[PDB]
Amino acid sequence: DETTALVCDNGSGLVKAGFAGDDAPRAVFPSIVGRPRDSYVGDEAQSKRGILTLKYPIEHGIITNWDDMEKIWHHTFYNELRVAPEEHPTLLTEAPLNPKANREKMTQIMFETFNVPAMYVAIQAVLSLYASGRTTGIVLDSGDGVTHNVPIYEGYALPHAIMRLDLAGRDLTDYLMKILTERGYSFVTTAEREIVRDIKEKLCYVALDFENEMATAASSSSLEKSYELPDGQVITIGNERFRCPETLFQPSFIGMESAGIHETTYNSIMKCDIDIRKDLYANNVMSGGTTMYPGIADRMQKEITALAPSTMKIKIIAPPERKYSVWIGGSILASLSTFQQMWITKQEYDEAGPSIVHRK
C-alpha cells in the first residue's frame, strides 16, 4: 500500500503543493523566480529582493514563462516537498479557459524534464466544487491575480458561461495602500507592501451595507482596529477595513469600469439554460484567498438576492478552509480509486506525445 500521488496547485501568487490524501497543502510559497539583479524561487527570492529581479510566471492564473515555471516546479519537488518526481503521479491545476497548447506544454514538461510516471491537469474551479462533495454549482474563485466565475454541471464547466475579472488580492492590497497612505500614513516600498498585505488579511472585512457601515465608522469607533508595525509603532485602521474588500463589488474604487463579483456571478448563471440556473444559485461556492473576507458570504447572498427572481433559493458555500479549496479538491479527487483510471501514463505519453492531455 504505497506510491502517493502529488497535488500541485499552481497559483498566480501562491503555489500550493502536498500529497493526495492530506487535508491540507504541505507547502505554500509565492510564485516568483529571482534572477541576478544565481537564481532563487519562492520565499528566498522574496528575501533577497534587492539583489534579484522578480518575475511572476503566472500573472493571471495562466503560465506565461516556461523556463521560470520549470524553476518553480523543480523547487517545489526538491526543496519544498523534498521528493523524487520520477516516482510520484502528479495532479496539476490550471486556470479556466487555459489554452490547449499551454496545457500540452505542461504535460510535455512533466514527462520530459521530471519524468513523472503519470499525471493529470485539472481545472482549478472544478476542484473547488469537488472539495464540497458536489459536482454541480457555480464557483467564484478569486486569488492573488485573477477572479473567475465558473458554472459547472455534473463536472462539466460551461466555457461560454465563464466570467473572468481582472481584479484580485494583489489589487486590493495595492488599494489598501493608497487609502491608508491617504489617511496620513506612508506605504509605498515593497516591505510596506507586505505589511499592508498582512493588515488586509487580518483586519479587513466586507460590509453587508456599505453606506450604513461607512457612516457608522465616520460617526464613531467599534469599526476601528489597531495594528502593530515592525517598528512597534501601532496604528489604527478605520473604514479602510471594509473600503478595501468593497472594491470586489465596486471595481470603480480603482477606476476599473467592469462588473463586480456579484454581477459576474449573476451573468455567469444567466449564460446558462433556464432549467439549471436554480442549481447554480443554490450551490454558489467561494474559493481563493481573496474570498476569505468575513461577511463576504452574507454580502454576496444579499446582492444576488437583489438580482435574481424573488423565488430563487440562493445559497453561498464558503468553507473556512476555502483559501485552499482548489488544492483540497485536488487531494480528494486524486485519492479516489475511481480516479486512478484517469491518470496520463508515461507510456500513453510516449505513444502519443503531448496533446494526450485532452480528455478533460
Ligand X SMILES: Nc1ncnc2c1ncn2[C@@H]1O[C@H](COP(=O)(O)OP(=O)(O)OP(=O)(O)O)[C@@H](O)[C@H]1O
Binding stretches for ligand X (CB under 6 A): 11-14, 61, 143-146, 168-170, 173, 197, 200-201, 288-290, 292-293, 323
The residue to which cell 489554452 is assigned: 99
Name the minimum Å distance from CB 29 to ligand X.
10
The cell for 232 is 512597534
- Cα separation, 149 vs 102, in Å, equals 21
Torsion angle, alpha carbons of 192, 195, 196, 198, to 10: 160
Q: Does 278 interact with other proteins (rule: CB under 8 A)?
A: yes
* Residue 133 binds other proteins, judged by CB under 8 A: yes
Choose the binding region for other proteins from 65-73, 147-155, 286-294, 298-306 (rule: CB under 8 A).
Answer: 147-155
Q: Which residue of the chain is nearest ligand X when measured via CB?
A: 143
Per CB under 8 A, does 320 bind other proteins?
no
- Grid cell 445559497 is found at 315
Instruction: State how far the Cα of 289 lies from the Cα of 294, in Å rounded to an integer.
Output: 12
**Dihedral angle sign, alpha carbons of residues 200, 205, 207, 208:** positive
Q: Of the ranges 201-209, 246-254, 286-294, 336-344, which one interacts with other proteins (CB under 8 A)? A: 336-344
Q: Is residue 313 close enough to count as binding other proteins by CB under 8 A?
A: yes
**Applying CB under 8 A, which part among 35-43, 63-71, 153-161, 344-352 lies near other proteins?**
153-161
Q: Shortest gap between Cβ of 111 and other proteins (angstroms)?
A: 19
Distant-in-sequence, close-in-space partners of 119: CB < 8 Å, separation ≥ 6: 89, 90, 91, 92, 107, 110, 111, 343, 344
- Of the candidate residues 64, 336, 340, 348, the single one contacting other proteins (CB under 8 A): 336
Q: Kindly tell me which of 36 and 159 has the beta carbon lying closer to other proteins.
A: 159
> Can residue 219 be called a binding residue for other proteins (CB under 8 A)?
no
DSSP label at 22? B
